Ligand binder design. Structure first.
Ligand SMILES: Nc1nc2ccccc2[nH]1
Ligand SMILES: Oc1ccc(Cl)cc1
Ligand SMILES: Oc1ccc(Cl)cc1
Lengths: 188, 185
Protein backbone atom coordinates (compact mmCIF):
# COMPACT_ATOMS: atom_id res chain seq x y z
CA UNK A 1 0.00 0.00 0.00
CA UNK A 2 2.99 2.41 0.39
CA UNK A 3 2.77 3.16 -3.37
CA UNK A 4 -0.77 4.54 -2.87
CA UNK A 5 0.26 6.47 0.26
CA UNK A 6 3.18 8.13 -1.62
CA UNK A 7 0.89 9.54 -4.34
CA UNK A 8 -2.83 9.28 -3.37
CA UNK A 9 -3.93 11.51 -6.28
CA UNK A 10 -2.69 9.00 -8.88
CA UNK A 11 -5.08 6.29 -7.57
CA UNK A 12 -8.21 8.00 -6.12
CA UNK A 13 -8.18 11.32 -8.08
CA UNK A 14 -8.29 14.91 -6.81
CA UNK A 15 -8.16 14.92 -2.98
CA UNK A 16 -9.05 18.65 -2.57
CA UNK A 17 -12.20 19.33 -4.67
CA UNK A 18 -14.25 16.38 -3.27
CA UNK A 19 -14.21 14.20 -6.42
CA UNK A 20 -11.67 11.78 -4.91
CA UNK A 21 -13.66 11.69 -1.65
CA UNK A 22 -16.86 10.55 -3.39
CA UNK A 23 -14.91 8.10 -5.60
CA UNK A 24 -14.05 6.30 -2.31
CA UNK A 25 -17.78 5.53 -1.86
CA UNK A 26 -18.33 4.49 -5.50
CA UNK A 27 -15.33 2.13 -5.51
CA UNK A 28 -16.80 0.36 -2.45
CA UNK A 29 -20.28 0.37 -4.08
CA UNK A 30 -18.89 -1.34 -7.23
CA UNK A 31 -17.56 -4.18 -5.05
CA UNK A 32 -20.90 -4.38 -3.17
CA UNK A 33 -22.89 -4.57 -6.43
CA UNK A 34 -20.47 -7.32 -7.57
CA UNK A 35 -21.29 -9.29 -4.38
CA UNK A 36 -25.05 -8.60 -4.56
CA UNK A 37 -25.30 -9.90 -8.17
CA UNK A 38 -24.11 -13.36 -7.02
CA UNK A 39 -27.30 -13.84 -4.90
CA UNK A 40 -31.02 -13.97 -5.75
CA UNK A 41 -32.47 -11.15 -3.59
CA UNK A 42 -29.60 -8.67 -4.10
CA UNK A 43 -29.82 -5.58 -1.88
CA UNK A 44 -27.15 -3.04 -0.98
CA UNK A 45 -27.53 -0.31 1.65
CA UNK A 46 -25.35 2.82 1.51
CA UNK A 47 -25.51 4.86 4.74
CA UNK A 48 -24.01 8.29 5.44
CA UNK A 49 -23.40 8.32 9.21
CA UNK A 50 -23.46 11.40 11.47
CA UNK A 51 -19.64 11.27 11.92
CA UNK A 52 -19.10 11.61 8.11
CA UNK A 53 -18.24 7.92 7.67
CA UNK A 54 -20.00 5.87 4.98
CA UNK A 55 -21.05 2.22 5.32
CA UNK A 56 -21.92 -0.09 2.41
CA UNK A 57 -23.71 -3.40 3.13
CA UNK A 58 -24.64 -6.24 0.78
CA UNK A 59 -26.58 -9.48 1.39
CA UNK A 60 -24.34 -11.62 -0.87
CA UNK A 61 -22.21 -14.68 -0.13
CA UNK A 62 -19.62 -12.75 1.92
CA UNK A 63 -15.95 -12.15 1.00
CA UNK A 64 -13.78 -15.31 1.45
CA UNK A 65 -12.43 -15.58 5.02
CA UNK A 66 -10.06 -18.59 4.82
CA UNK A 67 -6.29 -18.25 5.12
CA UNK A 68 -4.45 -17.49 1.86
CA UNK A 69 -1.68 -20.16 1.45
CA UNK A 70 0.95 -17.72 0.09
CA UNK A 71 0.15 -14.58 2.13
CA UNK A 72 -0.58 -16.42 5.42
CA UNK A 73 -3.56 -14.22 6.37
CA UNK A 74 -7.32 -14.31 5.69
CA UNK A 75 -8.34 -13.89 2.04
CA UNK A 76 -10.41 -10.88 3.19
CA UNK A 77 -7.24 -9.18 4.53
CA UNK A 78 -5.43 -9.87 1.23
CA UNK A 79 -8.26 -8.08 -0.66
CA UNK A 80 -8.07 -5.12 1.77
CA UNK A 81 -4.22 -4.81 1.77
CA UNK A 82 -2.93 -5.87 -1.71
CA UNK A 83 -2.99 -3.55 -4.75
CA UNK A 84 -11.72 -0.19 -10.82
CA UNK A 85 -8.98 1.01 -8.45
CA UNK A 86 -9.59 -1.71 -5.81
CA UNK A 87 -11.00 -1.53 -2.26
CA UNK A 88 -7.39 -1.66 -0.97
CA UNK A 89 -6.97 1.95 -2.20
CA UNK A 90 -10.05 2.98 -0.16
CA UNK A 91 -8.59 1.16 2.87
CA UNK A 92 -5.17 2.84 2.43
CA UNK A 93 -6.75 6.32 2.33
CA UNK A 94 -9.17 5.72 5.25
CA UNK A 95 -8.07 6.71 8.77
CA UNK A 96 -10.40 3.93 9.95
CA UNK A 97 -12.13 1.03 8.17
CA UNK A 98 -14.44 -1.56 9.75
CA UNK A 99 -15.00 -4.88 7.95
CA UNK A 100 -17.86 -7.26 8.90
CA UNK A 101 -18.39 -10.52 6.93
CA UNK A 102 -21.29 -12.90 7.57
CA UNK A 103 -20.54 -16.31 6.02
CA UNK A 104 -20.96 -20.05 6.84
CA UNK A 105 -23.03 -19.20 9.94
CA UNK A 106 -20.27 -16.97 11.39
CA UNK A 107 -19.71 -13.23 11.94
CA UNK A 108 -16.14 -12.14 11.07
CA UNK A 109 -14.81 -8.74 12.23
CA UNK A 110 -11.64 -6.74 11.46
CA UNK A 111 -10.60 -3.11 12.00
CA UNK A 112 -8.05 -1.16 9.92
CA UNK A 113 -6.39 2.23 10.45
CA UNK A 114 -4.73 3.84 7.40
CA UNK A 115 -4.72 0.39 5.72
CA UNK A 116 -3.03 -1.36 8.69
CA UNK A 117 -5.07 -4.19 10.27
CA UNK A 118 -5.35 -3.83 14.07
CA UNK A 119 -5.71 -7.59 14.54
CA UNK A 120 -6.29 -10.72 12.42
CA UNK A 121 -9.80 -11.35 11.04
CA UNK A 122 -11.72 -12.86 13.97
CA UNK A 123 -14.92 -14.90 14.28
CA UNK A 124 -16.87 -12.96 16.95
CA UNK A 125 -20.28 -14.68 16.79
CA UNK A 126 -23.02 -16.50 14.89
CA UNK A 127 -25.56 -15.46 12.25
CA UNK A 128 -28.33 -16.82 10.00
CA UNK A 129 -27.57 -14.14 7.37
CA UNK A 130 -24.79 -13.72 4.79
CA UNK A 131 -23.03 -10.66 3.34
CA UNK A 132 -20.22 -8.11 3.58
CA UNK A 133 -20.20 -4.71 5.30
CA UNK A 134 -17.48 -2.05 4.94
CA UNK A 135 -17.64 1.22 6.91
CA UNK A 136 -14.86 3.75 6.30
CA UNK A 137 -13.77 7.07 7.77
CA UNK A 138 -11.94 9.05 5.03
CA UNK A 139 -8.44 10.15 6.08
CA UNK A 140 -8.41 13.87 6.89
CA UNK A 141 -4.62 13.82 6.31
CA UNK A 142 -5.33 12.96 2.63
CA UNK A 143 -8.76 14.54 2.00
CA UNK A 144 -8.65 18.33 2.44
CA UNK A 145 -11.01 21.27 1.80
CA UNK A 146 -14.09 19.14 0.88
CA UNK A 147 -14.35 16.53 3.68
CA UNK A 148 -18.14 15.94 4.04
CA UNK A 149 -20.32 13.70 1.84
CA UNK A 150 -22.90 15.43 -0.37
CA UNK A 151 -26.13 13.38 -0.50
CA UNK A 152 -27.05 14.50 -4.04
CA UNK A 153 -23.74 13.27 -5.55
CA UNK A 154 -24.34 9.77 -4.11
CA UNK A 155 -28.11 9.80 -4.86
CA UNK A 156 -27.56 10.70 -8.54
CA UNK A 157 -24.87 8.04 -9.12
CA UNK A 158 -26.75 5.22 -7.35
CA UNK A 159 -29.87 6.03 -9.40
CA UNK A 160 -27.81 5.77 -12.63
CA UNK A 161 -26.31 2.46 -11.39
CA UNK A 162 -29.75 0.95 -10.59
CA UNK A 163 -30.77 0.93 -14.29
CA UNK A 164 -27.53 -0.89 -15.30
CA UNK A 165 -27.94 -3.52 -12.54
CA UNK A 166 -31.35 -5.19 -12.89
CA UNK A 167 -32.86 -6.86 -9.82
CA UNK A 168 -30.46 -5.13 -7.39
CA UNK A 169 -32.13 -3.10 -4.63
CA UNK A 170 -30.03 -0.02 -3.73
CA UNK A 171 -30.98 1.88 -0.56
CA UNK A 172 -29.42 5.23 0.37
CA UNK A 173 -29.81 6.60 3.93
CA UNK A 174 -28.56 9.82 5.52
CA UNK A 175 -28.42 9.60 9.33
CA UNK A 176 -27.51 13.33 9.57
CA UNK A 177 -30.99 14.56 8.47
CA UNK A 178 -33.00 11.29 8.11
CA UNK A 179 -33.32 11.55 4.30
CA UNK A 180 -33.48 8.27 2.36
CA UNK A 181 -34.04 6.81 -1.12
CA UNK A 182 -34.74 3.40 -2.67
CA UNK A 183 -33.48 2.70 -6.21
CA UNK A 184 -34.72 -0.68 -7.50
CA UNK A 185 -35.04 -1.24 -11.26
CA UNK A 186 -36.46 -4.72 -12.05
CA UNK A 187 -36.06 -4.66 -15.85
CA UNK A 188 -35.45 -7.73 -18.02
CA UNK B 1 6.74 -1.36 5.68
CA UNK B 2 3.15 -2.59 6.39
CA UNK B 3 4.58 -5.77 8.00
CA UNK B 4 6.29 -3.53 10.60
CA UNK B 5 3.15 -1.38 11.10
CA UNK B 6 1.06 -4.54 11.56
CA UNK B 7 3.14 -5.94 14.47
CA UNK B 8 5.43 -3.12 15.77
CA UNK B 9 6.37 -5.00 18.97
CA UNK B 10 7.97 -7.83 16.96
CA UNK B 11 10.49 -5.40 15.36
CA UNK B 12 11.13 -2.59 17.88
CA UNK B 13 10.23 -4.28 21.22
CA UNK B 14 7.40 -3.77 23.72
CA UNK B 15 5.47 -0.60 22.74
CA UNK B 16 3.74 -0.15 26.15
CA UNK B 17 6.49 -0.44 28.83
CA UNK B 18 8.93 2.00 27.13
CA UNK B 19 11.35 -0.63 25.73
CA UNK B 20 10.32 -0.10 22.10
CA UNK B 21 10.27 3.70 22.48
CA UNK B 22 13.92 3.79 23.57
CA UNK B 23 15.01 1.12 21.05
CA UNK B 24 13.89 3.62 18.34
CA UNK B 25 16.76 5.89 19.44
CA UNK B 26 19.25 2.98 19.62
CA UNK B 27 18.48 1.77 16.06
CA UNK B 28 19.17 5.28 14.71
CA UNK B 29 22.33 5.49 16.89
CA UNK B 30 23.63 2.19 15.38
CA UNK B 31 23.53 3.77 11.89
CA UNK B 32 25.07 7.04 13.18
CA UNK B 33 28.00 5.10 14.73
CA UNK B 34 28.66 3.22 11.44
CA UNK B 35 28.70 6.58 9.61
CA UNK B 36 30.80 8.31 12.30
CA UNK B 37 33.41 5.48 12.26
CA UNK B 38 34.20 6.13 8.55
CA UNK B 39 34.62 9.94 8.96
CA UNK B 40 37.64 11.98 10.09
CA UNK B 41 35.89 13.54 13.05
CA UNK B 42 34.11 10.69 14.83
CA UNK B 43 31.38 12.34 16.90
CA UNK B 44 27.64 11.75 17.21
CA UNK B 45 25.16 13.98 19.04
CA UNK B 46 21.91 12.59 20.47
CA UNK B 47 19.48 15.38 21.44
CA UNK B 48 16.21 14.97 23.37
CA UNK B 49 14.02 17.89 22.25
CA UNK B 50 11.33 19.64 24.34
CA UNK B 51 8.51 18.41 22.04
CA UNK B 52 9.40 14.71 22.73
CA UNK B 53 11.37 14.10 19.52
CA UNK B 54 14.95 12.85 19.37
CA UNK B 55 17.61 13.82 16.83
CA UNK B 56 20.80 11.87 16.10
CA UNK B 57 23.61 13.65 14.20
CA UNK B 58 26.92 12.35 12.88
CA UNK B 59 29.84 14.10 11.16
CA UNK B 60 30.66 11.28 8.71
CA UNK B 61 30.52 11.26 4.90
CA UNK B 62 26.74 11.64 4.58
CA UNK B 63 24.65 8.66 3.41
CA UNK B 64 24.42 8.13 -0.40
CA UNK B 65 21.98 10.50 -2.17
CA UNK B 66 22.15 9.26 -5.80
CA UNK B 67 19.28 7.45 -7.50
CA UNK B 68 19.08 3.71 -6.76
CA UNK B 69 18.91 1.98 -10.20
CA UNK B 70 16.42 -0.76 -9.18
CA UNK B 71 14.07 1.21 -6.89
CA UNK B 72 14.20 4.42 -8.97
CA UNK B 73 14.46 6.76 -5.95
CA UNK B 74 17.35 8.20 -3.89
CA UNK B 75 19.53 5.62 -2.09
CA UNK B 76 18.71 7.52 1.12
CA UNK B 77 14.97 6.88 0.56
CA UNK B 78 15.62 3.15 -0.05
CA UNK B 79 17.39 3.00 3.35
CA UNK B 80 14.42 4.82 4.97
CA UNK B 81 11.64 2.75 3.26
CA UNK B 82 12.88 -0.84 2.54
CA UNK B 83 13.57 -3.57 5.14
CA UNK B 84 20.22 -5.00 13.41
CA UNK B 85 16.59 -4.08 12.60
CA UNK B 86 17.23 -0.80 10.70
CA UNK B 87 16.09 2.84 10.48
CA UNK B 88 13.25 1.87 8.10
CA UNK B 89 11.49 0.38 11.17
CA UNK B 90 12.07 3.66 13.06
CA UNK B 91 10.70 5.61 10.07
CA UNK B 92 7.59 3.39 9.84
CA UNK B 93 6.80 3.93 13.56
CA UNK B 94 7.46 7.71 13.59
CA UNK B 95 4.55 10.11 13.02
CA UNK B 96 7.20 12.46 11.59
CA UNK B 97 10.85 11.99 10.54
CA UNK B 98 13.22 14.68 9.23
CA UNK B 99 16.29 13.60 7.21
CA UNK B 100 19.19 16.00 6.53
CA UNK B 101 22.28 14.84 4.59
CA UNK B 102 25.36 17.01 4.02
CA UNK B 103 27.39 15.44 1.20
CA UNK B 104 29.48 16.48 -1.85
CA UNK B 105 29.10 20.21 -1.11
CA UNK B 106 25.27 20.05 -0.87
CA UNK B 107 22.56 19.95 1.82
CA UNK B 108 19.76 17.43 1.12
CA UNK B 109 16.41 17.38 2.97
CA UNK B 110 13.42 15.03 3.14
CA UNK B 111 10.38 14.66 5.40
CA UNK B 112 8.50 11.44 6.17
CA UNK B 113 5.19 10.90 7.97
CA UNK B 114 4.50 7.35 9.25
CA UNK B 115 7.21 6.09 6.85
CA UNK B 116 5.71 7.85 3.80
CA UNK B 117 7.98 10.38 2.02
CA UNK B 118 6.25 13.75 1.56
CA UNK B 119 8.53 14.65 -1.36
CA UNK B 120 11.68 13.26 -3.05
CA UNK B 121 15.07 13.96 -1.41
CA UNK B 122 15.87 17.52 -2.52
CA UNK B 123 18.98 19.71 -2.64
CA UNK B 124 18.16 22.74 -0.45
CA UNK B 125 21.54 24.55 -0.32
CA UNK B 126 25.35 24.46 -0.20
CA UNK B 127 27.70 23.48 2.63
CA UNK B 128 31.34 22.69 3.44
CA UNK B 129 30.41 20.16 6.16
CA UNK B 130 29.47 16.48 5.84
CA UNK B 131 27.20 14.16 7.82
CA UNK B 132 23.70 12.80 8.35
CA UNK B 133 20.98 13.89 10.77
CA UNK B 134 17.69 12.14 11.57
CA UNK B 135 15.11 13.71 13.89
CA UNK B 136 12.02 11.61 14.61
CA UNK B 137 8.71 12.03 16.43
CA UNK B 138 7.56 8.63 17.76
CA UNK B 139 4.00 7.75 16.71
CA UNK B 140 1.66 8.14 19.71
CA UNK B 141 -0.68 5.66 17.96
CA UNK B 142 2.01 2.96 18.40
CA UNK B 143 3.76 3.98 21.64
CA UNK B 144 1.44 4.00 24.68
CA UNK B 145 1.73 4.48 28.47
CA UNK B 146 5.49 5.28 28.44
CA UNK B 147 5.50 8.02 25.77
CA UNK B 148 8.30 10.30 27.06
CA UNK B 149 12.05 9.64 26.73
CA UNK B 150 13.83 8.94 30.03
CA UNK B 151 17.31 10.52 29.94
CA UNK B 152 19.05 7.83 32.02
CA UNK B 153 17.85 4.92 29.82
CA UNK B 154 19.55 6.59 26.82
CA UNK B 155 22.65 7.61 28.83
CA UNK B 156 23.17 4.04 30.11
CA UNK B 157 23.14 2.53 26.60
CA UNK B 158 25.29 5.28 25.03
CA UNK B 159 27.86 4.77 27.82
CA UNK B 160 28.00 1.03 26.97
CA UNK B 161 28.43 1.90 23.26
CA UNK B 162 31.29 4.36 23.98
CA UNK B 163 33.45 1.55 25.45
CA UNK B 164 32.69 -0.78 22.51
CA UNK B 165 33.19 1.99 19.90
CA UNK B 166 36.43 3.43 21.32
CA UNK B 167 37.15 5.96 18.57
CA UNK B 168 33.67 7.54 18.62
CA UNK B 169 32.68 10.57 20.72
CA UNK B 170 29.05 10.41 21.94
CA UNK B 171 27.31 13.55 23.24
CA UNK B 172 23.87 13.41 24.90
CA UNK B 173 21.80 16.60 25.38
CA UNK B 174 18.40 17.09 27.06
CA UNK B 175 16.71 20.35 25.99
CA UNK B 176 13.84 19.87 28.51
CA UNK B 177 16.02 20.44 31.62
CA UNK B 178 19.46 21.31 30.13
CA UNK B 179 21.07 18.02 31.26
CA UNK B 180 24.04 16.69 29.28
CA UNK B 181 26.82 14.08 29.09
CA UNK B 182 29.87 13.33 26.93
CA UNK B 183 30.93 9.67 26.59
CA UNK B 184 34.35 9.04 25.01
CA UNK B 185 36.86 6.22 25.67
N1 LIG C 1 -2.07 8.96 11.36
C1 LIG C 1 -1.56 8.08 10.50
N2 LIG C 1 -1.35 8.31 9.20
C2 LIG C 1 -0.78 7.13 8.72
C3 LIG C 1 -0.33 6.79 7.44
C4 LIG C 1 0.21 5.53 7.24
C5 LIG C 1 0.30 4.61 8.27
C6 LIG C 1 -0.14 4.93 9.55
C7 LIG C 1 -0.68 6.19 9.75
N3 LIG C 1 -1.18 6.82 10.88
O1 LIG D 1 -20.67 -4.59 0.46
C1 LIG D 1 -19.33 -4.64 0.18
C2 LIG D 1 -18.80 -5.77 -0.43
C3 LIG D 1 -17.44 -5.85 -0.69
C4 LIG D 1 -16.62 -4.80 -0.33
CL1 LIG D 1 -14.91 -4.91 -0.62
C5 LIG D 1 -17.13 -3.67 0.27
C6 LIG D 1 -18.49 -3.59 0.52
O1 LIG E 1 23.39 10.11 12.09
C1 LIG E 1 22.68 9.20 11.36
C2 LIG E 1 23.27 8.44 10.35
C3 LIG E 1 22.51 7.57 9.60
C4 LIG E 1 21.16 7.46 9.86
CL1 LIG E 1 20.18 6.41 8.87
C5 LIG E 1 20.56 8.18 10.87
C6 LIG E 1 21.32 9.06 11.62
Amino acid sequence: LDAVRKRPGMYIGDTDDGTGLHHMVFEVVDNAIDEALAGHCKEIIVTIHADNSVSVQDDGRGIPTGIHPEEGVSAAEVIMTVLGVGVSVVNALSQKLELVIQREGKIHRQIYEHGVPQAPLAVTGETEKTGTMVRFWPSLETFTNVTEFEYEILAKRLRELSFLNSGVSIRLRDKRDGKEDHFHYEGG
